[PDB]
Symmetry: D2
């Protein structure tokens, strides 16, 4: 199995304050489960080849998704911003598979990704433990 444990850092009150509004797990690799402990979020997966998505909403209405997973035994991540209300995590997570429009991002196996949204919010995912089965990453909103 693989696990990915996320710590969420929100840096800048001017961007508003984000909370989780959805959590999905893709069905490959015998699926997986999200759990929470001590304010952290862990995705546990049945092997290499699947992923999960957290969707966040800010108190200013901004919607963004963070995807993490393991592809061919290496971690990957992506952040999608500027989402419409109908673009739920249930819509987004499958887009990384079955030759969907985001598959290329999964294939990159990124240990770090940075993107800034249409309303100016800075997002970074950065793995702090980048190899092995017990992976760790910081999700930073700025």
């Amino acid at each position: 199995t693989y696990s990915i444990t996320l710590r969420v850092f929100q840096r800048n009150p001017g961007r508003g304050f984000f909370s989780i509004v959805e959590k999905t797990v893709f069905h490959y690799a015998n699926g997986g489960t999200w759990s929470e402990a001590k304010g952290t979020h862990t995705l546990t997966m049945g092997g290499s080849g699947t992923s999960g998505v957290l969707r966040f909403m800010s108190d200013k209405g901004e919607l963004i998704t963070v995807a993490v997973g393991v592809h061919n035994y290496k971690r990957w991540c992506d952040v999608v911003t500027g989402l419409k209300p109908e673009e739920t995590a249930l819509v987004i997570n499958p887009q990384y598979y079955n030759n969907g429009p985001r598959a290329y991002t999964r294939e990159k196996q990124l240990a770090e990704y940075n993107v800034t949204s249409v309303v100016g919010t800075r997002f970074e995912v950065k793995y702090t433990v980048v190899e092995g089965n017990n992976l760790e990453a910081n999700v930073i909103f700025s």
Copy 2:
């Protein structure tokens, strides 16, 4: 908009103890969001015609999903038990739409549903506020 607020009642320690491992929102009706407050869980939706699923896992390994939504201006619900690890909420939620195998259950517009699983766990969903836009239901594991 419609909201459905759930209170989870776990009755019987012999069944183990369940926690939420996934939360999905279907993309119809401009989507929606899950939120938590005072130990309760609220699905807020952009109109009639969509839904969301909570997947639960017990500390004895049992996996079950609870689906709630609004179909043609009336609440509906379903509970699916005996799930395999690969049958995530991401798999289950869409099965209520696009002529999927669970669409019939949504169409019933049930205000109450009772089912007992293969390992003997009793599940009930019961709406306590059954009409209007601010719906309320108890989810009982027994």
Copy 3:
């Protein structure tokens, strides 16, 4: 160290739904901390001879406290019901020490305790692991 992990079972929607409104840790035995994981609550203490209290409020307005700790290397518990708003856990926890009015209950070192409040709500604390340093109990509201 000693830890006590609690699982909260709520049986009867007629009593309303309870959530935690305060958590205290008494200062003996190098204190301790509350943490949450997978819907469970763990009090971790620096040794035998201290305790902590969760105060709960129901959505029907009922206030009650659950105390757990270790006294002379054996677990103990208590439940206090019918609290007034000013009787916070900060008031209650110290009453088990310094010859306070609740010390007698700590001294009993109970592995189980049952009480019914004046409004008819049944409360039970029952330890399912009653010996050693990694203690476990169910807290049952009914």
Copy 4:
């Protein structure tokens, strides 16, 4: 009633990640309760003249407390760092009253306070709504 709603911002992963390990409510002004909603924390009090404390622990072992309250109809705040394990929030909260050693900080009725701990962690409490009965503050760790 007075309420104080807190949003917690953590800026700098180098300081580690903090989670709440205790929440107290002082017994004056008919007490009060802590609640959580959408990742925010609200202290609801029966009137002016009381307070509550959140104690946080980082995953690097640092212990700190944040006190908020209303004194003579104006908000107040304080932060105490470098705590030993036995200095729980149960010890700290009462120190703001009965001519205790921290009363002077309550009496200042501060809308903002900044402190850096001996290990280099910056803490700020800043009220964003500083008047009326529905007060709001950001708690920033850096």
